[PDB]
Design a protein around this ligand. Structure first.
Ligand code: HC4
Length: 125
């Protein structure tokens, strides 16, 4: 297993070195989005939590296609405020309930070290 703790202060530096295969060794869900919300990376732990097949969601828009329950001021609204500002670091609890059993999770959104990319980390609560 890859040893990185959910919510670590330097998580973006640690994950910058990770290929899709190493991202799959994380103890929590990790999704990398571009500024428009398109999925660039989606790890195995995230698929375990949500039921989505990782390879199938890459390239889809997270807010429009995959996760409509997140299209709200409380999730997507925070993401879009962060992209526009060029800075994002927020953690909050949320319930995923689209085409799945309602599941309570802790979400951490953070701007990646890379230019136009943002991370969404997820763990069960
Ligand atoms: C609500 O529509 C949430 C859906 C969802 C959350 C996280 C995922 O990775 C996939 C779908």
């Amino acid at each position: 297993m890859e040893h990185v703790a959910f919510g670590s202060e330097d998580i973006e530096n640690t994950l910058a070195k990770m290929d899709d295969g190493q991202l799959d060794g994380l103890a929590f869900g990790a999704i990398q989005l571009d500024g428009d919300g398109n999925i660039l990376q989606y790890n195995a732990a995230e698929g375990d939590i949500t039921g989505r097949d990782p390879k199938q969601v890459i390239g889809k828009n997270f807010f429009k296609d995959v996760a409509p329950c997140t299209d709200s001021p409380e999730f997507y609204g925070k993401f879009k405020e962060g992209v526009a500002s060029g800075n994002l670091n927020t953690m909050f609890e949320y319930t995923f309930d689209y085409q799945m059993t309602p599941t309570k999770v802790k979400v951490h959104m953070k701007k990646a070290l890379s230019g136009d990319s943002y991370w969404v980390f997820v763990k069960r609560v």
